[PDB]
């Protein structure tokens, strides 16, 4: 037992684990609980989500259990991580609308409402009781100033001037991972390289908080083109996994204009075929291009998947 | 926490349960461990036992994980539950080649190679183990000669005279629930109505060898059609699930002509739509038979799912 573990890396999908070792333990030892998650910072999902949503999909498959946290408190706070101008409060009434679009998706990425698989959890639930005095007590206690000046995130930031709310986002990112690592038993969370910080931060704070019972983070790495162009970004924004934001049609040739060099791997991060199936499917690549099979069962595959076997039929059929 | 049974109870697939109640408790409690099996018999798996696999199948929906045993040792011997006429052993080559197509097709109905889901073990691993001596020892010292006659099975061949290997099957098949119970942490095995004698006992023989350890036995019940005719045969003698016994046309067909009555029940028995896609797919069955689309999407499921998507195509064109 090791299979799991051993593909993520065939493919490279782990830029970064916490404790290496002890990931590849209790993985190949117990059912692993691992989570996700955005703040609703709008009301689609996009190519940039598409990766580590998948990544959790391929847990489920050896038997673990994926969580997706939407961010329904994080969410109007926003997470200053990577950017470098301070964010910008949306409106309750936004973010209400937002996570009915950015779960819309997930629902249909996951499967929800099993006995035992796959839970859809809106911080909102716990991030909304926690007030002011207690928050300071219970929880701000035990995070040190030095240490959040510490993030790679803020670091930055606190160069052109980081708000303090900025500033207090990671602590309510931590709170969550503690508490999902309780109450449903979460010890592995993934997420993407700019949420390193957060990852890493969520494990100290329950390591003075009760002596880290039994957490762990992986991070996928970030998706990068051959052609060196902000992987993601179209004229029309960005990618977005909304019919009517970025249709099969648009979605489809995304992918099958795919830059024959950055292919393979494309087809390792975001499809489920085997390494033989890619292995052939990297033959008829290297030598017969002229039918761009890869670029083809590529596309296929994630318009299939992320938008319908009909909105590929219908999608095909536009050439 | 209890949709799984709720179901199950809905499409009607429980013929009996031995400890009804503790089953909905550790469904709704733990993610449970079930099991199902035959003996190769023969080369080819069918309709007759497509059902229970597929309900192991609706568990693993829900988080639960199912186990695969092929009859490596208990094959040799032949179950004579229902038989009213002794076996006849088969020779090894045979038994060694049916197991080859018997199991050739579960691996296509379960995903087996994960890392927590899905075994497929051959009792003949540890049945090929213990000895005459041992087995009478161990075993057969627990196994009280009056609860054997006491099977439902054999009570019938006593009449017409059984043999003592037909009457010792029962003890193999014990042995067996209790070997993975302890094993790989079997607690429901699942079988058909013919199964009950066997079920019950494996679970007796754990109770005086340990104090029956949290095992359960639950039993789909018996496809019926309305013609009153022996569902799963044809004049070419039973629908076999294998192309080169029974082909997707040949079987397509057997779907599309179902005797209108005795439909809905079969889309619930062994298709994965819901309750309400199934309700729809009634009225337009009630009122608009005509175009016959539930015997239509019934086929077309259970064909593109034991065949395939491609086998499917292939078949729908013949009409
Ligand atoms: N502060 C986190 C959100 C969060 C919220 C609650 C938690 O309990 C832990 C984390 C973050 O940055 N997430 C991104 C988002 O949109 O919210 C998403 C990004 O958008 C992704 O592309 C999708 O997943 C990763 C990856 O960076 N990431 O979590
Ligand atoms: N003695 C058992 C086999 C067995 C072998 C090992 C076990 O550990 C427990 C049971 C039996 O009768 N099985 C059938 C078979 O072909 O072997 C199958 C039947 O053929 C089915 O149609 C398929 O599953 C059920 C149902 O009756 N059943 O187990």
């Not at 926690?130 to 300071?136: C, D, M, N, Q, V």
Request: charged share 25%.
């Amino acid at each position: 037992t090791n299979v799991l573990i051993e593909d993520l890396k065939w493919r490279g999908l782990i830029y970064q684990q916490t404790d290496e070792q002890g990931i590849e333990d209790l993985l190949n030892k117990e059912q692993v609980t691992l989570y996700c998650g955005a703040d609703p910072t709008a009301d689609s999902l996009h190519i940039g989500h598409l990766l580590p949503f998948l990544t959790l999909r391929r847990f489920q498959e050896h038997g673990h259990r994926p969580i997706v946290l939407i961010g329904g408190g994080t969410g109007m706070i926003g997470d200053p991580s990577g950017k470098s101008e301070e964010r910008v409060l949306q409106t309750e009434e936004q973010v209400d609308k937002n996570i009915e679009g950015i779960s819309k998706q997930m629902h249909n990425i996951f499967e929800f409402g099993t006995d035992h698989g796959a839970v859809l959890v809106n911080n909102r639930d716990w991030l909304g009781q926690i007030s002011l005095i207690s928050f300071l007590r219970d929880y701000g206690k035990h995070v040190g100033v030095n240490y959040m000046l510490g993030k790679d995130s803020i670091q930055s930031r606190l160069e052109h001037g980081i708000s303090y709310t900025e500033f207090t986002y990671t602590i309510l990112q931590a709170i969550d991972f503690g508490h999902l690592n309780r109450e449903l038993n979460c010890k592995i969370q993934v997420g993407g390289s700019d949420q390193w910080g957060n990852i890493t931060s969520g494990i100290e704070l329950m390591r003075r908080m009760y002596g880290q019972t039994d957490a762990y983070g992986l991070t996928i790495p970030l998706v990068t083109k051959s052609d060196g162009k902000k992987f993601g970004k179209s004229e029309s924004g960005a990618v977005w996994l909304d019919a009517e934001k970025t249709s099969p049609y648009e979605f489809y040739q995304f992918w099958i204009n795919q830059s024959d060099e950055d292919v393979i791997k494309f087809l390792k991060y975001f499809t489920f075929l085997g390494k033989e199936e890619i292995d052939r499917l990297e033959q008829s690549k290297n030598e017969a291009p002229h039918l761009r099979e890869a670029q083809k069962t590529l596309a296929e595959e994630v318009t299939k998947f992320i938008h319908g076997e009909d909105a590929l039929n219908d999608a095909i059929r536009i050439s």
